[PDB]
């Protein structure tokens, strides 16, 4: 009548991905965690752009959209920041935002590439991921001589459920029952399906025998980061955030039950 | 001398490419107006 007791193993941990296995949990929990990785892990991204000058060949909304998509290091600041909608400030304050400025003019005869390196932050710890000290800088726009781009932007906290620019992942691999022992899929011709990298079948065996008493256990994840957070921090933030959602629901339900 | 099949495909598209390098696609309009 009670809670699962999941265990975890990390099989790979780099700067850009974390690969791990959760055992002794239910499929619904595993999938909910996956969903939270994508859509409910908060991140900092540009969401307010004032354009003072733009002589480039790209119109203002084009530039603003591209700026919105630039990933910014969020690793420790994002937990401190408040949601702009919740802040008592009137416009934007250091408690709910990070200011950026960009001011580039092409005065030479070679094309000027405006990259994320030209985005100057007010916070040393919230900067474009490609500016962190190989990977080039993210191109924003290209300028020829006499063209100019001058703007001011604010980055705020959000999550992928609102807009994909706040999605911290670059692909969440997820998989269970690599050998199709539960028959959750049915192959018309099993032998022509390639083995999963987590398969433990011999080369002559196409799928495991059917298991009438089996349940999905042992979920395999490979969470790739877009750079805004470290992959393990994505996972931990997801676990904490889902727990917070459940706690808030519990508080509201307690009020509702007591009110009757 | 003779173009062989394995060469034929490349050869035919080289001929067609040269045609379009010479004529373009609105040659009939321009030629008629020039006349």
């Amino acid at each position: 009548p009670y809670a699962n007791q999941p265990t975890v193993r990390i099989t790979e941990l780099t700067d850009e991905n974390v690969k791990f296995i959760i055992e002794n949990t239910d499929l619904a929990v595993a999938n909910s965690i996956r969903r939270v990785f994508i859509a409910e892990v908060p991140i900092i991204a540009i969401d307010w752009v004032q354009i003072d000058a733009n002589s480039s060949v790209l119109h203002d909304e084009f530039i603003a959209h591209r700026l919105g998509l630039i990933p910014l290091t969020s690793d420790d600041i994002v937990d401190k920041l408040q949601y702009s909608r919740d802040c008592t400030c009137e416009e934007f304050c250091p408690e709910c935002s990070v200011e950026f400025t960009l001011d580039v003019r092409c005065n030479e005869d070679q094309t000027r590439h405006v990259t994320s390196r030209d985005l100057i932050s007010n916070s040393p710890r919230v900067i474009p991921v490609t500016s962190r000290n190989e990977q080039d800088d993210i191109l924003i726009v290209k300028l020829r001589k006499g063209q100019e781009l001058r703007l001011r932007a604010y980055a705020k906290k959000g999550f992928g459920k609102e807009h994909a620019k706040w999605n911290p992942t670059a692909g969440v691999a997820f998989e269970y029952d690599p050998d199709n022992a539960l028959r959750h899929t049915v192959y018309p011709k099993p032998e022509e399906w390639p083995k999963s990298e987590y398969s433990e079948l011999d080369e002559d065996e196409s799928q495991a025998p059917y298991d009438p008493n089996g349940k999905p256990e042992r979920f395999y994840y490979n969470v790739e980061s877009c750079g805004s957070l470290r992959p393990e921090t994505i996972v931990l933030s997801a676990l904490s955030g889902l727990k917070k959602k459940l706690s808030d629901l519990q508080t509201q339900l307690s009020h509702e039950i007591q009110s009757d | 001398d003779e173009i062989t099949p394995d060469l034929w495909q490349e050869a035919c598209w080289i001929v067609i490419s040269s045609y379009f390098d010479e004529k373009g696609l609105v040659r009939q309009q321009l030629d008629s107006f020039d006349e």
Partner: protein, 49 residues
Amino acid sequence: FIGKIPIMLRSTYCLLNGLTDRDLCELNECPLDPGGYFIINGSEKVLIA
């Protein structure tokens, strides 16, 4: 003088005839534009065969 004849673009008697892509771009014309049409009161007209 007996009148004016609208000129088909990129034909032999158009100002763009023979220009290089760089010359076309200096005139704010697209090099890929095929021509073969007229400009009558600013409007691009094509004759249908």
